[PDB]
């Protein structure tokens, strides 16, 4: 009866990929986490009464140039593309990442993290929303400081997978 899913969390460095995943997995907000390592977390969750075992591939992070390794496209059932609402460069980069990803595969969602930082925000909600609409993808904003927003992210990619499945 059980169901395994492997999810890759992509984005520019310091957007909060690790912080988000850890919020969800451990239920606590981390400051000290190293941006170099790739890590793979597990979690169990029930979505519409189906129990999933999630493998969450928190990538180191990438930029305009870096080429996709094969762990970014083999055996992946969902992608979470994260930018930070405080970094325009993170937002330009995530459009690049999304382009490369369609070519390197031939269920993706977009998350604008760090929404709690109202004095540093330089990307509007609607910019993110418009972009994901342009990809035909789900969009959420999140704060790694706020558990429900991180839970909502990872739940959402499963919900997205259930339709596209
Ligand atoms: N205020 C705030 N800080 C965050 C958020 N997400 C990540 N951070 C911080 O931003 C820095 C980079 O986070 P990290 O998860 O390492 O980004 P990664 O490099 O994409 O994994 C760390 O100091 C985090 O504590 C958020 O939603 N809100
Ligand atoms: Mg990290």
Features:
globular, 165 residues, 4 helices, alpha/beta, Rossmann fold, ubl conjugation, 6 strands, binds guanosine-5'-diphosphate, Small_GTP-bd, GTP binding, GTPase activity, binds magnesium ion, prenylation
At a glance:
This protein has 165 residues and is of the alpha/beta class. Helices cover 33% and strands 27% of the residues.
Helix content: 25-40%
CATH superfamily descriptor = P-loop containing nucleotide triphosphate hydrolases
- Named at the architecture level, the CATH assignment is 3-Layer(aba) Sandwich
The neighbouring-strand order within the major sheet is: 2-3-1-4-5-6
DSSP summary, beta strand count: 6
- What ligands does this structure carry? guanosine-5'-diphosphate, magnesium ion
**Head-to-tail CA distance between termini:** 17 Å
> β content, as a range?
25-35%
**Cα Rg:** 15 Å
CATH C-level class is Alpha Beta
- Structure class: alpha/beta
- What general form does the structure show? globular
* Overall domain count: 1
* Major sheet: 6 strands, mixed
The arrangement of helices and strands along the chain is EHEEEHEHEH
CATH topology: Rossmann fold
PDB class: signaling protein
Keywords: GTPase, mTORC1 signaling, Rheb, signaling protein
Assembly: monomeric
Entry title: Structure of Rheb-GDP
């Amino acid at each position: 009866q059980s169901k395994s899913r492997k999810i890759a969390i992509l984005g520019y460095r310091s957007v909060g990929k690790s912080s988000l995943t850890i919020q969800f997995v451990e239920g606590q907000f981390v400051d000290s986490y190293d941006p170099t390592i790739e890590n793979t977390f597990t979690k169990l969750i029930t979505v519409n009464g189906q129990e999933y075992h999630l493998q969450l591939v928190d990538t180191a992070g990438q930029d305009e140039y870096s080429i996709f390794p094969q762990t970014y496209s083999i055996d992946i059932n969902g992608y979470i593309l994260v930018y930070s609402v405080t970094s325009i460069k993170s937002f330009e980069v995530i459009k690049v990442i999304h382009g490369k990803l369609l070519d390197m595969v031939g269920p993706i969602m977009l998350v604008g993290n760090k929404k709690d930082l109202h004095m540093e925000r330089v990307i509007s909600y609607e910019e993110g929303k418009a972009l994901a609409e342009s990809w035909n993808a789900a969009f959420l904003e999140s704060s790694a400081k706020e558990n429900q927003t991180a839970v909502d992210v990872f739940r959402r990619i499963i919900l997205e997978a259930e339709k596209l499945e």
